[PDB]
């Protein structure tokens, strides 16, 4: 950037978006930075707008192109265009390779119900060798259980050791067949992507930003699923809320898959395609929101810019831009590490 | 989707503002939950999750347990005719 | 259509699932989107395990 | 002779039962795991098509820095060659 | 198939189509995305009519 100047100093999704808008409108533009840096805030005592919203009402700017959430309080002062990118509150969790060694993973080939059902046939056949021929007969039937299914001259005892032989045959062939099915393909496999499943358990914690639109969504929500999510985070110790967005993403990474963070899907989908490539958006979003472009009330560029965005989305331009700075220019190494 | 009003209509901007109010107060998502999920005929077909089970099923192993006990029972029937002959 | 009954006066407001398109924005005033959507995939979930 | 098959005393009889279930899992864990390296041996390209060369990033690929070859992928509107050009254009280090 | 647009476009056993006349079909027509244009060129030449 030090070796560059003008509008070519910056790059990003909004940078290309400003060029397309100006192309269909036919005016020259200049890319300026907001002073205070924090946009869309109105003080409760002084009632003075700050950020980029205050630069349009106070005439310090003509148009604003940036990820600005469309809210009702901002619509009463400036003009908002139609949304150019949809999003919503999503769930971000670390991708569990699993890669889950242990003893619970040894009895994994057979199911939890077969390991506990084979023993019912063991003691069932060793107790038949009692009947076909107690401290020496169980001592014998166990000596007749190890070596297939001793001294059985009666025809009654001959077919007991034969069917038990075919019975243990299918079990040991089954143990080998499925035990190869997970050294060949690993899902593997958890967890659930939905949000209602994330609330019904307390093993893995979850929280939102300490102050923002995300926390206020659950506070006044009158839906059954989301209210139980609010009564948890309100009485969840320690503090499940983070100070900034950079601290919430850094808390899911150092939690061994035991902490989740709820945030917008645009930021969530962007982190998934960035190093170290571990976060993965799971399940649909929770609410419906979108960004937009702002112009002053009664300005000469309000309606002309609104009509230009609808021409961009229809020709497939916006989705081509979303696919540009998210997945094409993404440093996703998990698409190359999960297939190797 | 959206609500449409004629160009330069009086009730144009008031309805536009009135949609943002219902959205943030959650009245839109609550009504969406009303005529879709709540009054829905498959409200149960939306909670059960279908995942890839890791372990091997018990049902196929059942076909082996029903042929073993089917042999144990046939074995105790021959044990009695051999005890009399 | 409903857009016609707004430009032609036979009604005052049209409330329905009305897709927000550019060709309709030039002739009528659209509110903010009260319901987001997109083209999706419908498949019969198996129903393969017997 | 107890090691080869399965594993007159109750003490040794349960040495017979338990030595088998241990060697039974190992031979299965040998058999099951060995099938995974032969099924992965069937995952060779080997030798694939020019398109599949672009679908993976383990083996890198590039052309000359300036010539009739590099320009081909640039203005090729074909989806396969365009995916190749987008990779080589931003692949670091310089391919 | 896994839930995705490309897994629907990578195979051709489970076919797929849209409505004959509507904003759905016109999407894939003028779409300049690699994954979608592949789906368009499939259904545009798919027989029998999907
Ligand atoms: C007809 N096969 C058969 O009778 N066997 N097959 C066996 C067998 C079973 C499955 C496979 N894949 C292989 Br290789 C060999 C078998 C496996 C054992 C074992 C003993 C046997 C002997 C048995 C019942 O102790 C440790 O694991
Ligand atoms: C390092 N080992 C390992 O990661 N596994 N052990 C695998 C494993 C487990 C037991 C044996 N005897 C062998 Br060989 C390999 C494994 C076995 C499974 C299974 C998944 C796995 C994958 C993981 C849990 O589903 C059903 O059976």
Curated annotation (Swiss-Prot), chain A:
Residues 150-154 are cytoplasmic. The gene is Gria2. Detected in forebrain. Detected in dendrites of neuronal cells. Expressed in the pyramidal cell layers of CA1 and CA3 and in the granule cell layer of the dentate gyrus. The M4 transmembrane segment mediates tetramerization and is required for cell surface expression. GO terms for biological process: cellular response to amine stimulus; cellular response to brain-derived neurotrophic factor stimulus; cellular response to glycine; cerebral cortex development; chemical synaptic transmission; conditioned place preference; establishment of protein localization; ionotropic glutamate receptor signaling pathway. Ionotropic glutamate receptor that functions as a ligand-gated cation channel, gated by L-glutamate and glutamatergic agonists such as alpha-amino-3-hydroxy-5-methyl-4-isoxazolepropionic acid (AMPA), quisqualic acid, and kainic acid. L-glutamate acts as an excitatory neurotransmitter at many synapses in the central nervous system and plays an important role in fast excitatory synaptic transmission. Residues 176-340 are extracellular. The chain holds residues 433 to 802 of 883 of the full protein. Residues 134-147, 148-149 dip into the membrane without crossing it. The modification Phosphoserine is found at residues 221, 255. This is Glutamate receptor 2. It comes from Rattus norvegicus (Rat).
From Swiss-Prot, chain B:
Palmitoylated. Depalmitoylated upon L-glutamate stimulation. In contrast, Cys-84 palmitoylation does not affect cell surface expression but regulates stimulation-dependent endocytosis. Ubiquitinated by RNF167, leading to its degradation. Induction: Down-regulated in the pyramidal cell layer of CA1 in the hippocampus by global ischemia. Detected in forebrain. Detected in dendrites of neuronal cells. Expressed in the pyramidal cell layers of CA1 and CA3 and in the granule cell layer of the dentate gyrus. The record marks 21 as: Interaction with the cone snail toxin Con-ikot-ikot. It is found in: Cell membrane; Postsynaptic cell membrane; Postsynaptic density membrane. It comes from the Eukaryota. A lipid is attached at residue 84 (S-palmitoyl cysteine). The chain crosses the membrane at residues 61-81. The M4 transmembrane segment mediates tetramerization and is required for cell surface expression. Belongs to the glutamate-gated ion channel (TC 1.A.10.1) family. GRIA2 subfamily. The postsynaptic actions of L-glutamate are mediated by a variety of receptors that are named according to their selective agonists. This receptor binds AMPA (quisqualate) > L-glutamate > kainate. This is Glutamate receptor 2. The chain holds residues 753 to 837 of 883 of the full protein.
UniProtKB/Swiss-Prot annotation, chain D:
Detected in forebrain. Detected in dendrites of neuronal cells. Expressed in the pyramidal cell layers of CA1 and CA3 and in the granule cell layer of the dentate gyrus. Coiled coil: none annotated. Residues 6-7 dip into the membrane without crossing it. L-glutamate binds at residues 68-69. The postsynaptic actions of L-glutamate are mediated by a variety of receptors that are named according to their selective agonists. This receptor binds AMPA (quisqualate) > L-glutamate > kainate. Ionotropic glutamate receptor that functions as a ligand-gated cation channel, gated by L-glutamate and glutamatergic agonists such as alpha-amino-3-hydroxy-5-methyl-4-isoxazolepropionic acid (AMPA), quisqualic acid, and kainic acid. L-glutamate acts as an excitatory neurotransmitter at many synapses in the central nervous system and plays an important role in fast excitatory synaptic transmission. The M4 transmembrane segment mediates tetramerization and is required for cell surface expression. This is Glutamate receptor 2. The chain holds residues 603 to 702 of 883 of the full protein.
Swiss-Prot record, chain E:
The modification Phosphoserine is found at residue 31. Detected in forebrain. Detected in dendrites of neuronal cells. Expressed in the pyramidal cell layers of CA1 and CA3 and in the granule cell layer of the dentate gyrus. Coiled coil: none annotated. The record marks 2 as: Crucial to convey clamshell closure to channel opening. L-glutamate binds at residues 23-24. Palmitoylated. Depalmitoylated upon L-glutamate stimulation. Induction: Down-regulated in the pyramidal cell layer of CA1 in the hippocampus by global ischemia. The record marks 29 as: Interaction with the cone snail toxin Con-ikot-ikot. It comes from the Eukaryota. It is found in: Cell membrane; Postsynaptic cell membrane; Postsynaptic density membrane. Homotetramer or heterotetramer of pore-forming glutamate receptor subunits. Tetramers may be formed by the dimerization of dimers. May interact with MPP4. Forms a ternary complex with GRIP1 and CSPG4. Interacts with ATAD1 in an ATP-dependent manner. ATAD1-catalyzed ATP hydrolysis disrupts binding to ATAD1 and to GRIP1 and leads to AMPAR complex disassembly. Interacts with GRIP2. Interacts with GRIP1. Interacts with NSF via its C-terminus. Interacts with CACNG2, PICK1 and GRIP2. Interacts with GRIA1 and SYNDIG1. Part of a complex containing GRIA2, NSF and NAPA and/or NAPB. Belongs to the glutamate-gated ion channel (TC 1.A.10.1) family. GRIA2 subfamily. The M4 transmembrane segment mediates tetramerization and is required for cell surface expression. This is Glutamate receptor 2. It comes from Rattus norvegicus (Rat).
């Amino acid at each position: 950037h030090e070796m560059l100047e003008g509008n070519e100093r910056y790059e990003g999704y909004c940078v290309d978006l400003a060029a397309e808008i100006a192309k269909h409108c036919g005016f020259k533009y200049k890319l300026t930075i907001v002073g205070d840096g924090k946009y869309g805030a109105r003080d409760a005592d002084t009632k003075i707008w700050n950020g980029m919203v205050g630069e349009l009402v106070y005439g310090k700017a003509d148009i604003a192109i940036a990820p600005l959430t469309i809210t009702l309080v901002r619509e009463e002062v400036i003009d908002f265009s139609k949304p150019f990118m949809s999003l919503g509150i999503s769930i971000m969790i670390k991708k569990p390779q699993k890669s889950k060694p242990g003893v619970f993973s040894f009895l994994d080939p057979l199911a939890y119900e077969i390991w506990m059902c084979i023993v019912f046939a063991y003691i069932g056949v060793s107790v038949v060798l009692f009947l076909v021929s107690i401290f020496n007969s169980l001592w014998f039937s166990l000596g007749a259980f190890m070596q297939q299914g001793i001294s059985p001259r009666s025809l009654s005892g001959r077919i007991v050791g034969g069917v038990w032989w075919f019975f243990t045959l299918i079990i040991i062939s089954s143990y080998t067949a499925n035990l190869a099915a997970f050294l060949t393909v690993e899902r593997m496999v958890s967890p659930i992507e939905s949000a209602e499943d994330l609330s019904k358990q307390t093993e893995i914690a979850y929280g939102t930003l300490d102050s923002g639109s995300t926390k206020e969504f659950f506070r006044r929500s009158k839906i059954a699923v989301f209210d139980k999510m609010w009564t948890y985070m309100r009485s969840a110790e320690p503090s499940v809320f983070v100070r900034t967005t950079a601290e919430g993403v850094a808390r899911v990474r150092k939690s061994k898959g035991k902490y989740a963070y709820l945030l917008e899907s645009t930021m969530n989908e962007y982190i998934e395609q960035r190093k170290p490539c571990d976060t993965m958006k799971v399940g649909g979003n929770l609410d419906s929101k979108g960004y937009g472009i702002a112009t002053p009330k009664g300005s000469s560029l309000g309606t002309p810019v609104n009509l230009a965005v609808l021409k961009l989305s229809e020709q497939g331009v916006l989705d081509k831009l979303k696919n540009k700075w998210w997945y094409d220019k993404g440093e996703c190494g998990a698409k190359d590490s999960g297939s190797k | 989707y959206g609500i449409a009003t004629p160009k330069g209509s009086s009730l144009g901007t008031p309805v536009n503002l009135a949609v943002l109010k219902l959205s943030e107060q959650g009245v839109l998502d609550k009504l969406k939950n009303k005529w879709w999920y709540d009054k829905g005929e498959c409200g149960a077909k939306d909670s059960g999750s279908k995942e890839k089970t890791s372990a091997l099923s018990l049902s196929n192993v059942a076909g082996v347990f029903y042929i073993l006990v089917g042999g144990l029972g046939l074995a105790m029937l021959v044990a009695l005719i051999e005890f009399c002959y």
